[PDB]
Amino acid sequence: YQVLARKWRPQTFADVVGQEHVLTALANGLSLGRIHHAYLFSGTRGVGKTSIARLLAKGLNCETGITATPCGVCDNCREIEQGRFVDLIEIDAASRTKVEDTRDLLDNVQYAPARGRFKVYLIDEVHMLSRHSFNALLKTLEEPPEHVKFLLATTDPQKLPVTILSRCLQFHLKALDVEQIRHQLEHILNEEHIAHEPRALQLLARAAEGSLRDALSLTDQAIASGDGQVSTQAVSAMLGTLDDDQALSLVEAMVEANGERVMALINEAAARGIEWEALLVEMLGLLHRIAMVQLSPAALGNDMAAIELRMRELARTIPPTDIQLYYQTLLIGRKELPYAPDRRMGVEMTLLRALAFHPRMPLPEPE
Amino acid sequence: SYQVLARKWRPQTFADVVGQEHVLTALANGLSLGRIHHAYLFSGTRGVGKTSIARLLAKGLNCETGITATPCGVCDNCREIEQGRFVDLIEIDAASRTKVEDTRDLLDNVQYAPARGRFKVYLIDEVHMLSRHSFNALLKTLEEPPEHVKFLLATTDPQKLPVTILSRCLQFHLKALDVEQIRHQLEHILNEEHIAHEPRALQLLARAAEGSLRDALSLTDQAIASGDGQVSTQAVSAMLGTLDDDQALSLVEAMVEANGERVMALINEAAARGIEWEALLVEMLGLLHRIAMVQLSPAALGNDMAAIELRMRELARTIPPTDIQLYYQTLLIGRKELPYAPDRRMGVEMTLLRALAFHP
Amino acid sequence: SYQVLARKWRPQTFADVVGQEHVLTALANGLSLGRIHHAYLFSGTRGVGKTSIARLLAKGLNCETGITATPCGVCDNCREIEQGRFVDLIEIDAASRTKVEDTRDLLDNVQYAPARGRFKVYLIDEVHMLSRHSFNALLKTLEEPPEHVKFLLATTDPQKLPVTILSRCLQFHLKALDVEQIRHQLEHILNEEHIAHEPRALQLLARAAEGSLRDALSLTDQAIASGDGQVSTQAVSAMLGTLDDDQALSLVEAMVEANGERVMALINEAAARGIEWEALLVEMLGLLHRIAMVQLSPAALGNDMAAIELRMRELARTIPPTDIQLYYQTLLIGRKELPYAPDRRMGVEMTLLRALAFHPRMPLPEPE
Amino acid sequence: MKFTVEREHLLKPLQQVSGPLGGRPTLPILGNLLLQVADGTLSLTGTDLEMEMVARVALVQPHEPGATTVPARKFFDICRGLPEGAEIAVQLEGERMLVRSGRSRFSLSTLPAADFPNLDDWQSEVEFTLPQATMKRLIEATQFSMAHQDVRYYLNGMLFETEGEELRTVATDGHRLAVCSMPIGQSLPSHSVIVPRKGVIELMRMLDGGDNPLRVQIGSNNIRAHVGDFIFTSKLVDGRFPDYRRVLPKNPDKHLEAGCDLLKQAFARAAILSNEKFRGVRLYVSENQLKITANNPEQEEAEEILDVTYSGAEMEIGFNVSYVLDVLNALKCENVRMMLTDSVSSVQIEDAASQSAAYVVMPMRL
Amino acid sequence: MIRLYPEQLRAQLNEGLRAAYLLLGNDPLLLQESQDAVRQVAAAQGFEEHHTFSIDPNTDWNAIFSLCQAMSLFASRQTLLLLLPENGPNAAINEQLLTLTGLLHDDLLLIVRGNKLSKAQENAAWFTALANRSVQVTCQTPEQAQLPRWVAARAKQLNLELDDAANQVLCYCYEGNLLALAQALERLSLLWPDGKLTLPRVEQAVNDAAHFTPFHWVDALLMGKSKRALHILQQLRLEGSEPVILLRTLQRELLLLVNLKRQSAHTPLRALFDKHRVWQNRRGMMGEALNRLSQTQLRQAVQLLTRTELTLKQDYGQSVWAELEGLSLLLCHKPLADVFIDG
Ligand SMILES: Nc1ncnc2c1ncn2[C@@H]1O[C@H](COP(=O)(O)OP(=O)(O)OP(O)(O)=S)[C@@H](O)[C@H]1O
Ligand SMILES: Nc1ncnc2c1ncn2[C@@H]1O[C@H](COP(=O)(O)OP(=O)(O)OP(O)(O)=S)[C@@H](O)[C@H]1O
Ligand SMILES: Nc1ncnc2c1ncn2[C@@H]1O[C@H](COP(=O)(O)OP(=O)(O)OP(O)(O)=S)[C@@H](O)[C@H]1O
Numbered sequence A: 001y002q003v004l005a006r007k008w009r010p011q012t013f014a015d016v017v018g019q020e021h022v023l024t025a026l027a028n029g030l031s032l033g034r035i036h037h038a039y040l041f042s043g044t045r046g047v048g049k050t051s052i053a054r055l056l057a058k059g060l061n062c063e064t065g066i067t068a069t070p071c072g073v074c075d076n077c078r079e080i081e082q083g084r085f086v087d088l089i090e091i092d093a094a095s096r097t098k099v100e101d102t103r104d105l106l107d108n109v110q111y112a113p114a115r116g117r118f119k120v121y122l123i124d125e126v127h128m129l130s131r132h133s134f135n136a137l138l139k140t141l142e143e144p145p146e147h148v149k150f151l152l153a154t155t156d157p158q159k160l161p162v163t164i165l166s167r168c169l170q171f172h173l174k175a176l177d178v179e180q181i182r183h184q185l186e187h188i189l190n191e192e193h194i195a196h197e198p199r200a201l202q203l204l205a206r207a208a209e210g211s212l213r214d215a216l217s218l219t220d221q222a223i224a225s226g227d228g229q230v231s232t233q234a235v236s237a238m239l240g241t242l243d244d245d246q247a248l249s250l251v252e253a254m255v256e257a258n259g260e261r262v263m264a265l266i267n268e269a270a271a272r273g274i275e276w277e278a279l280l281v282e283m284l285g286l287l288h289r290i291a292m293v294q295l296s297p298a299a300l301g302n303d304m305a306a307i308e309l310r311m312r313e314l315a316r317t318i319p320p321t322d323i324q325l326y327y328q329t330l331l332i333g334r335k336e337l338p339y340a341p342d343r344r345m346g347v348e349m350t351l352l353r354a355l356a357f358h359p360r361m362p363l364p365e366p367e
Numbered sequence B: 001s002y003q004v005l006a007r008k009w010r011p012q013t014f015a016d017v018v019g020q021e022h023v024l025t026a027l028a029n030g031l032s033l034g035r036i037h038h039a040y041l042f043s044g045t046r047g048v049g050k051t052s053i054a055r056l057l058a059k060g061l062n063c064e065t066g067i068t069a070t071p072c073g074v075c076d077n078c079r080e081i082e083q084g085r086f087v088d089l090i091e092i093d094a095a096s097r098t099k100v101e102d103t104r105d106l107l108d109n110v111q112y113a114p115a116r117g118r119f120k121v122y123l124i125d126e127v128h129m130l131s132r133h134s135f136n137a138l139l140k141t142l143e144e145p146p147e148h149v150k151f152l153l154a155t156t157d158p159q160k161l162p163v164t165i166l167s168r169c170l171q172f173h174l175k176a177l178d179v180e181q182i183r184h185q186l187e188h189i190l191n192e193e194h195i196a197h198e199p200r201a202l203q204l205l206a207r208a209a210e211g212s213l214r215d216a217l218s219l220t221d222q223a224i225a226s227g228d229g230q231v232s233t234q235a236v237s238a239m240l241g242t243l244d245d246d247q248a249l250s251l252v253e254a255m256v257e258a259n260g261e262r263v264m265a266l267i268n269e270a271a272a273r274g275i276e277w278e279a280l281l282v283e284m285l286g287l288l289h290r291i292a293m294v295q296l297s298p299a300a301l302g303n304d305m306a307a308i309e310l311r312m313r314e315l316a317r318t319i320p321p322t323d324i325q326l327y328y329q330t331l332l333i334g335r336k337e338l339p340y341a342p343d344r345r346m347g348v349e350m351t352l353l354r355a356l357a358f359h360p
Numbered sequence C: 001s002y003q004v005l006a007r008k009w010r011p012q013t014f015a016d017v018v019g020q021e022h023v024l025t026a027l028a029n030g031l032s033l034g035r036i037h038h039a040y041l042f043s044g045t046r047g048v049g050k051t052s053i054a055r056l057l058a059k060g061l062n063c064e065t066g067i068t069a070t071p072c073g074v075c076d077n078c079r080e081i082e083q084g085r086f087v088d089l090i091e092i093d094a095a096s097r098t099k100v101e102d103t104r105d106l107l108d109n110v111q112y113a114p115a116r117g118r119f120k121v122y123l124i125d126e127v128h129m130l131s132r133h134s135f136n137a138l139l140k141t142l143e144e145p146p147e148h149v150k151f152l153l154a155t156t157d158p159q160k161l162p163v164t165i166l167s168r169c170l171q172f173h174l175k176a177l178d179v180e181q182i183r184h185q186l187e188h189i190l191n192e193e194h195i196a197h198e199p200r201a202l203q204l205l206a207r208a209a210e211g212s213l214r215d216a217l218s219l220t221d222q223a224i225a226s227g228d229g230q231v232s233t234q235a236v237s238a239m240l241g242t243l244d245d246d247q248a249l250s251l252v253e254a255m256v257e258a259n260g261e262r263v264m265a266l267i268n269e270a271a272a273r274g275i276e277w278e279a280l281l282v283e284m285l286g287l288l289h290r291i292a293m294v295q296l297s298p299a300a301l302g303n304d305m306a307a308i309e310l311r312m313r314e315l316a317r318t319i320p321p322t323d324i325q326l327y328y329q330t331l332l333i334g335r336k337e338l339p340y341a342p343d344r345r346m347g348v349e350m351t352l353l354r355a356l357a358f359h360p361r362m363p364l365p366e367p368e
Numbered sequence D: 001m002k003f004t005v006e007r008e009h010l011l012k013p014l015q016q017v018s019g020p021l022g023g024r025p026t027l028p029i030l031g032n033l034l035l036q037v038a039d040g041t042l043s044l045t046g047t048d049l050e051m052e053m054v055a056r057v058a059l060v061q062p063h064e065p066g067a068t069t070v071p072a073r074k075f076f077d078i079c080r081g082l083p084e085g086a087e088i089a090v091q092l093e094g095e096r097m098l099v100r101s102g103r104s105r106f107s108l109s110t111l112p113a114a115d116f117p118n119l120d121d122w123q124s125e126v127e128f129t130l131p132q133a134t135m136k137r138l139i140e141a142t143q144f145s146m147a148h149q150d151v152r153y154y155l156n157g158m159l160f161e162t163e164g165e166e167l168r169t170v171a172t173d174g175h176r177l178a179v180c181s182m183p184i185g186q187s188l189p190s191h192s193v194i195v196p197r198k199g200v201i202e203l204m205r206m207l208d209g210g211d212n213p214l215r216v217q218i219g220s221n222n223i224r225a226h227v228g229d230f231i232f233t234s235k236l237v238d239g240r241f242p243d244y245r246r247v248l249p250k251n252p253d254k255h256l257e258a259g260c261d262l263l264k265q266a267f268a269r270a271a272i273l274s275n276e277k278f279r280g281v282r283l284y285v286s287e288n289q290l291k292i293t294a295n296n297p298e299q300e301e302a303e304e305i306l307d308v309t310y311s312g313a314e315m316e317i318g319f320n321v322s323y324v325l326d327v328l329n330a331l332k333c334e335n336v337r338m339m340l341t342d343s344v345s346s347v348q349i350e351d352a353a354s355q356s357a358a359y360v361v362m363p364m365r366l
Numbered sequence E: 001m002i003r004l005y006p007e008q009l010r011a012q013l014n015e016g017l018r019a020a021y022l023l024l025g026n027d028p029l030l031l032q033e034s035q036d037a038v039r040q041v042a043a044a045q046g047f048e049e050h051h052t053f054s055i056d057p058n059t060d061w062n063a064i065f066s067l068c069q070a071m072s073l074f075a076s077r078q079t080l081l082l083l084l085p086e087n088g089p090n091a092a093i094n095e096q097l098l099t100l101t102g103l104l105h106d107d108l109l110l111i112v113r114g115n116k117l118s119k120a121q122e123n124a125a126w127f128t129a130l131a132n133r134s135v136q137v138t139c140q141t142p143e144q145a146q147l148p149r150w151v152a153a154r155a156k157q158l159n160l161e162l163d164d165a166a167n168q169v170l171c172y173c174y175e176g177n178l179l180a181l182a183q184a185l186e187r188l189s190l191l192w193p194d195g196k197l198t199l200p201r202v203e204q205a206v207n208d209a210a211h212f213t214p215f216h217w218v219d220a221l222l223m224g225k226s227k228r229a230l231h232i233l234q235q236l237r238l239e240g241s242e243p244v245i246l247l248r249t250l251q252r253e254l255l256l257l258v259n260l261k262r263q264s265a266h267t268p269l270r271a272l273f274d275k276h277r278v279w280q281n282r283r284g285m286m287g288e289a290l291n292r293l294s295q296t297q298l299r300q301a302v303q304l305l306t307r308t309e310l311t312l313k314q315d316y317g318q319s320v321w322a323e324l325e326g327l328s329l330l331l332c333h334k335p336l337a338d339v340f341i342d343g
């Protein structure tokens, strides 16, 4: 019943998917004993900044000692897992943004930790602190007490002062790869004994750009929609993204200058009950993929492999100039869609623009 | 006490809601299976059932007969929620509660157990109006809240919210209701209200609803007030300023054939009769789209315009498709800038003269 | 923990101070001749030794031996200063002490004689943040301080400070340590700690430090962490690649040389970094504008940036005005149409492709 | 470490040590009082860096020696909030302090005593006992003249000079100098030190008219006062107090002896009838006559005539009413003698009976 | 009523002190050194009191009156300094000053420091009363043209040797910051006792710490020196000055230039200048600006300025400085196709 994101939070360094460089650096630092007093974590949403920070806190305060492989069973590990560890001070920058609040926070830094071996501080979205707060924090960051560790975190590291950046070891977490997201989703679903299909996992991974938290949220929503199962049809309906084959056929009809097929395809889409702007976006994405394939050969991911060969044909037959013309026509039509009398009418008129100005086979021009 | 149709016909069960089948199915399945999230964000256009669906979910969660997919609507808590009395259902306005103390007390009272129900639902409306510091402070609550509070978020546009908020919330995209759904709902409401209605009037009201059912109900109430308690086609047409005549086609023909004097005379007489200019532009856009369609496929023309068939066909035989696209583009540009023009008449005249400038 | 390099390798004597030769000589002459000014202002950038030099001056001015330019480093005062627990060494920050009450308390406490130090040195930091009231109070107390008190101001942006403070204070603005000094200091630190390293890794660390010894120390600590107790060229290069945020300049270079695969690789790296795509487009547009202005006038490239000075200069001198104009126009069009693109990533890729391998058909002013 | 006391014995010393210590501390540990139990005595020091108030209490329970620092505010609140008459047992476990009182237990976080600012081992330059009455008289005589807020930081306090078997206090604010001397009775080396305004205020606050001999220790830069089982240490304000010897006129031949009460009531009447600020009152003294007139060019001249016992040369001097009123208030007696040289000179005020205290003021030029 | 300069003030003090002194100007170093010289001469004469007060409505005056009407217990012939407010005296301050002049005493040495008074503020009752015994030392900061001679004289007084290159470097680095210039001269003298300061000597121990005003930037653009305009823009950016005031100051002169250029087709320049009542010293500068650029310019400049304002107060970005320096280069004799700047 518990949310996937909360339930499947990492509890050991092995559980973390991706971010190999930061994990290796932290493990080596803990093992060799060359531990710095201020670590800054950066990246995008849901990449695992807080997860890695909490894993490091567990490693530092573990009963067995400072190690890169915390046991996960001693009292400190359990308390940190439950978020009820007294020494692990989870602070929010926005909660205390004024200089007075951060000074009050730093007033108690000197006191020894209650039971843990370090008084770890974990500040979330540290970039929200004011300039005065940063300057006040500089002195403690440079020379903190030997039993005090700072674990800053922020999605935007460019806002921090240069002094703060130089006073701490930076670790910029990278957006997780689509394959890594898909593998993690498959692993968690298999562990939870839930039926799933490869296409559904691919669609979910594509939907989650690089944030695994978004992937987990979308997976939970798909579980709800599909009544305990992750089916390709359910995920496609929830995402509102029709199958790539229909958009590919639409663009093939558009380039061939045969409007009858275009009309039939849009009628079928209307019967299916799919928002028209999504169809236009899919057509634009297909055109962009064709243009990229023309630019470079390896421009299509394995997810589109099922339709790669066909796509390549469109790259060879269709010149680049008319590809750009079609892309621009579709983009301007999407620009005009909100002000059109109807979404169907807007898409139909955009397709008629594309056909009328078709370079190879222009629509007949009666006087 | 008398209430407007929007308040009278607010859905009270998961079956009374029209459209949005996917989100309703997901919510019902989650409630049945017990896999309930702690953050439900609803994104969509106005008048699609944000507040209605949120209140239905709150009733389902807080029902005294356990967590039920379809709340009965008769319990003490169910009735209080229906009447907006339930203390555990805190309805917060984001725009009003933007100050620091508001959010600070919002995240400080979470620890207190619910007064009456089993969940202390927080229904935050138009969440995109909250300040950035508010989102930053509420991230922790939205991530790992206690197991007695559920956050229900409603926003017209979700992209404006911080990416972290979207990450920590389950997003439900309420699809804009189509014309058929709006027409069916209006027909059902009028039949249950013992009010006579014509199919043409219902179609016109659904078309003018622009995908929002609350707007459809407001237009129906306006027609009722103006239509002496009768939803008549003539009354709705007068209220909505719909030409539904050959004036639009004649003006389009004049525009295509230059002849600025005819266009000016048509606009002058239309202004004298006092019509809606946005309706005129929409009618012209529809006619141009139909001309393009018949140029592509002659079979795509209906019989409603039979009286004006041949003349329309003449355009399909006389205007090249590129010119049709140019005229449609100019009309859309006029549509976009019509609200911002010094006057509606000035905007329409500028659009029509710009279209007149175009010619083979 | 084995301490950290920045903390361990604080310069505890004037002899072991890297760079800042002019400031060091001036301070040594002042201490030897016995002429000490009322207030000192150490300015410059971060990680150059402003705080370190201020603490060196404080410990040499209150040393048990006397006012000497070569503090012993073993007496009670020197050891206490090094440990950072000397009572008379009053280190304060303008951040949380701009309040009227706090400034008044500091002014009142100034009059009291030092506890066990020859001088009661006040090491104020970030003086440019002092409010107008606090600034005026500081000026008034600096107008005629007691003979037993001293002020060692350490700012980072003297332009904010009005020259009134300089009217009663002696400034010793530091300069960037330059690559060679930073590399030599890193080599000495690593050798003294029995740490294996390669010369190219040290060169990369020094060049990446950007004229800041503290940044170099942090970077080499990161290299040790990722290098597993040994700095190597591959480890430092990988760390820099992960930490590099100059994707806009590299993309501009690739577009200039029409290297499509390089553009794709850089876009993939930026996606891994997860930077805002509109922000990336704006940064590239600004870089193109700066290149155009540098071509117009060499002085247009301000000294505020120096890591990409050579790249900017070579790009400006190489490409002609027309090509940079076309790149700027294409990037502007791409930025404008980005909201309606199928995806932000796709929009960026499309505009990059258009700029590097296409050209827009310009309009024609048809005769009237 | 371990000891046991009664909250009745700790309510007063805790209040005393925690009194001056207020507001935020410059250093976090300065916000904490250092309590140490040793040789049957518990000493609590509420250090303020600039000032240190130490209160000592007697221990009869089987304590254990030890020292530690603890925040003053919460410890005082804990001691005060317990039931009246309840005994408090304090112990140290790990880095925390446990407080037991009957059925109640509390735990407090304690910083190490090493980080506490140590009281340096400076040896007092001049140590001597003194009764409270003499010190209180000196403070009362030489506290109204010190400048409350002056650019010259050394004039904010007042200068104590010990010479031979004599202790002298001199205070001034740029216009008047009040000097009061008292024979100590024990020969001591010559030494001068300036005590700040806050230090003397705290010292006079400590005075309570008791029989405990007040022991004063003057150091290089610190002054310490022992009263019974209480210690007050302050840091002497630096600088150099101007020598008072040059200020004292040599031969103020002109003399004026008059009833102190008469002058007091005359000045009070002038002040109440001349409440307008500025415009120092002008007094014309003549043979058996003293006419005080308001200098206010706008307000009506509230001239007041008194029959003083003066029979010398007549002259008009533009004094400040508030200054003379305060000076005469500082000298509470029945008769007062003022000695001056000429129109432009420093008139010295003294008691017609006693001459230990001198009040060399100067006229306000008109 | 003697108007003097700080350079020759030492002789005036030596020949005899005056009852009233007042330092008027904007140069900080000149004011500070004049004040120090006057105070030292007073101390040598036998004045031990150096009371200082800041004029402000919040501040009281009873202490000032008491100290001016009273001597010192252990000194005599006090000296009082008054720090005028930056904006200038107001009616209440005028009343206070004339009151002070009313009861002013010879033993008191009056010194006044503050921004130079205006023509309207120049005339006053207290000023006229003090004119009988008033010596006013002009303390304005020398112009860029006057800077090289001033620094050369300063170096010669310090027994140093400066060449043309070193003088130019010092002027460039400390333009309008003569206090920092003198401090740098002292530092260089200490570093090299020989006294010969060649170009490497000065350049290896100097920093860019000049201070400017938006009027200086507009003047630089009018002259057309790109390096100076870029340098002043950099200094203003580092000082944190907001671009709104720079944009307004530029806009005023741009509109004036556009009007002059458009209306100069058939109208004499002299009549237009007389009608506009512009500064006499700026007549030649305006003529040079007008004849340096034709109507082809002053059109993309206005459009660029409007675009800058829109992108400033609508997009709220941080690239305003880039647009400002682009416009700066445009106003100079530069091609500036304007495609980059979107003029
Ligand atoms: N690198 C990762 N390895 C494993 N699971 C991950 C990772 N990143 C995210 N997850 C999953 O997604 C959840 C959210 O991860 P968090 O680390 O809490 O997100 P976050 O990055 O801290 O949020 P931000 O950055 O403050 S918006 C975790 O509980 C995991 O279930
Ligand atoms: N999906 C729907 N199903 C049934 N009735 C609806 C629906 N959407 C709107 N309505 C009607 O419109 C009234 C008000 O609309 P809401 O339910 O509040 O939709 P909404 O999206 O919350 O409106 P906004 O976003 O606050 S302007 C309801 O009381 C219903 O009568
Ligand atoms: N000139 C230098 N010589 C040797 N080590 C240096 C030097 N400058 C910095 N370091 C090293 O960097 C550490 C921190 O340098 P700091 O002196 O604090 O830099 P900084 O000038 O104080 O930066 P600010 O003032 O906080 S912005 C020192 O402890 C040294 O290890």
Ligand SMILES: [Mg+2]
Binding pocket: A049, A050, A051, A124, A153
């Ligand atoms: Mg996080």
Ligand SMILES: [Mg+2]
Binding pocket: B050, B051, B052
């Ligand atoms: Mg609503």
Ligand SMILES: [Mg+2]
Binding pocket: C050, C051, C052, C154
């Ligand atoms: Mg520093």
Ligand SMILES: [Zn+2]
Binding pocket: A062, A063, A064, A070, A071, A072, A073, A074, A075, A076, A077
């Ligand atoms: Zn463990």
Ligand SMILES: [Zn+2]
Binding pocket: B063, B064, B065, B071, B072, B073, B074, B075, B078
């Ligand atoms: Zn119920």
Ligand SMILES: [Zn+2]
Binding pocket: C063, C064, C065, C071, C072, C073, C074, C075, C076, C077, C078, C079
């Ligand atoms: Zn020493």
